[PDB]
Amino acid sequence: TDILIDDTATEAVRTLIRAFPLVPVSQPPEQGSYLLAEHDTVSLRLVGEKSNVIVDFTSGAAQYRRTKGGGELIAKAVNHTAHPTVWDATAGLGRDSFVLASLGLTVTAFEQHPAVACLLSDGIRRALLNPETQDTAARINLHFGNAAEQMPALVKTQGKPDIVYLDPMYPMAYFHRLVGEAQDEVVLLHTARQTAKKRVVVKRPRLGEHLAGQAPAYQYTGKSTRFDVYLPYGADKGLEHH
Amino acid sequence: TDILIDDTATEAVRTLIRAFPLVPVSQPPEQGSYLLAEHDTVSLRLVGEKSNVIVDFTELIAKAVNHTAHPTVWDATAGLGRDSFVLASLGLTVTAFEQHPAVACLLSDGIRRALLNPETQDTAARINLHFGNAAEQMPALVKTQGKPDIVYLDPMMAYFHRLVGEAQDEVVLLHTARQTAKKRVVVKRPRLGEHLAGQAPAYQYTGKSTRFDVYLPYGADKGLE
Numbered sequence: 001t002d003i004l005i006d007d008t009a010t011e012a013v014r015t016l017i018r019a020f021p022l023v024p025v026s027q028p029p030e031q032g033s034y035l036l037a038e039h040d041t042v043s044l045r046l047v048g049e050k051s052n053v054i055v056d057f058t059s060g061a062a063q064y065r066r067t068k069g070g071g072e073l074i075a076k077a078v079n080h081t082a083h084p085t086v087w088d089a090t091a092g093l094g095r096d097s098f099v100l101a102s103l104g105l106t107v108t109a110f111e112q113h114p115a116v117a118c119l120l121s122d123g124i125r126r127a128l129l130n131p132e133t134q135d136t137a138a139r140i141n142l143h144f145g146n147a148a149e150q151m152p153a154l155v156k157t158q159g160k161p162d163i164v165y166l167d168p169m170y171p172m173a174y175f176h177r178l179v180g181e182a183q184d185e186v187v188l189l190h191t192a193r194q195t196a197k198k199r200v201v202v203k204r205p206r207l208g209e210h211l212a213g214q215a216p217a218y219q220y221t222g223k224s225t226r227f228d229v230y231l232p233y234g235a236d237k238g239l240e241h242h
Numbered sequence: 243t244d245i246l247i248d249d250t251a252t253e254a255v256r257t258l259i260r261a262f263p264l265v266p267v268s269q270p271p272e273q274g275s276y277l278l279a280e281h282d283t284v285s286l287r288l289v290g291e292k293s294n295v296i297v298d299f300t301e302l303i304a305k306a307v308n309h310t311a312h313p314t315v316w317d318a319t320a321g322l323g324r325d326s327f328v329l330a331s332l333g334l335t336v337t338a339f340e341q342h343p344a345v346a347c348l349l350s351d352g353i354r355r356a357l358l359n360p361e362t363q364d365t366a367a368r369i370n371l372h373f374g375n376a377a378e379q380m381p382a383l384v385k386t387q388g389k390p391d392i393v394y395l396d397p398m399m400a401y402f403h404r405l406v407g408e409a410q411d412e413v414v415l416l417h418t419a420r421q422t423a424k425k426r427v428v429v430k431r432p433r434l435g436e437h438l439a440g441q442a443p444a445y446q447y448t449g450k451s452t453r454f455d456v457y458l459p460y461g462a463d464k465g466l467e
Contacts, residue, residue, distance in 0.1 A: 029417075031413050031417065031439065031441070032409075032410050032413035032414070032417075032439075033404075033405040033406065033410050033413075044405055044406070045405075046401075046404070046405055051401065053401070053402055053405065093402070113406055115405075115406055116406055169399065169403070174295075175286075175295055175322070177288075178275040178286055178288055178295065178344075179275065179286070179342055179344050179345055183274050183275050186273050186274035186275075187274060190271075190272065190273065190274075212273070212274075214273075
């Protein structure tokens with residue numbers, strides 16, 4: 001991942017990007033995307049295109065309170081009034097991580113892609129500067145790495161989270177199912193079910209297929225969005241309740 | 243990737259697998275795939291199914307790589323090694339790159355077994371496997387044994403997907419290949435498939451239901467070929 005560091009880039013930005021395996025370039029590449037560190041923001045650009053992508057949680061809470069269709073059921077899916085800790089295994093741009101943290105939950109947001117993790121990190125950094133989003137941003141802990149591969153070690157380190165939240169961005173044929181995304185889904189769900197203390201929550205399109213082709217214990221259905229909930233391995237549905 | 247090592251696994255197999263970041267397991271996983279090392283073979287399995295995937299090696303592309311010039315070829319997307327073997331069959335020395343641990347392990351074992359087989363020994367000896375991401379390993383290999391004559395490629399929120407997804411990986415792959423090859427970068431594509439990384443090639447070879455877009459190294463004058 002290339003990163004163009006403009007002369008106006010603040011010291012905060014310069015220090016932040018230094019923690020990511022990026023490749024500083026003196027000019028934009030001839031093709032494709034690259035990161036741009038200008039002023040006090042890190043953004044992602046596409047050569048030849050004006051529109052960019054930036055993580056900005058300023059209107060996050062507002063956008064959430066106004067969303068309909070089922071996405072607003074995320075709070076009930078993780079049982080937010082129980083004050084659970086949550087590991088967001090597919091953080092990406094952090095939309096859901098910020099929403100969860102805004103409910104008062106302590107979130108560990110996993111993101112394995114260098115560019116995306118950097119974008120998210122800067123978004124959290126800027127969120128801490130705004131008095132209206134400071135408290136929430138402080139409850140978001142970025143974990144730069146692959147969740148399936150690193151959750152087991154983190155469990156031994158700081159204990160199991162109450163909730164593991166998943167929202168994959170996907171919703172020779174036989175061979176591809178064995179080594180491709182299908183297999184990755186199997187491993188992610190399995191690892192999440194060995195990790196969560198209370199539930200593994202998976203966001204899905206209304207008619208979306210079940211993650212790893214596995215049926216959940218119960219679901220929270222909206223019009224166009226739903227949440228599949230799996231109980232941790234060895235949990236007795238008789239004791240558990242929702 | 244999990245690997246179940248049966249007690250019958252030969253030392254040749256036990257040695258081969260040590261080159262990959264595989265997770266040894268005492269029993270198959272609850273669900274999904276895993277590698278099985280039994281007797282003198284490494285195979286891929288799916289829990290619940292009786293079948294198994296194994297690499298067993300027992301003219302359009304020839305022109306695309308201009309085999310007549312007997313060029314060295316680097317297969318940046320080796321996979322199960324089908325095209326690596328074909329290229330090697332033409333008498334060319336091939337260096338195959340594969341980044342997936344399971345796929346790489348399977349290919350490595352197929353090459354190893356092919357060497358033990360008379361009718362494939364000659365061809366298999368011309369295939370060298372390199373584990374890792376091509377975009378990353380090729381530059382490092384260049385500084386070692388030098389540039390190859392040809393780099394062979396055969397891969398396979400919207401805006402966001404294009405910037406960090408497969409679209410970007412394509413750009414990186416082609417760019418690196420064009421900086422590695424000394425003569426040509428050959429890309430396999432379906433009959434009327436779209437251009438890789440959305441870039442136009444210098445020329446191409448259209449076959450029955452397949453096509454090969456050919457790019458030239460950076461700073462190359464097409465008029466000289």
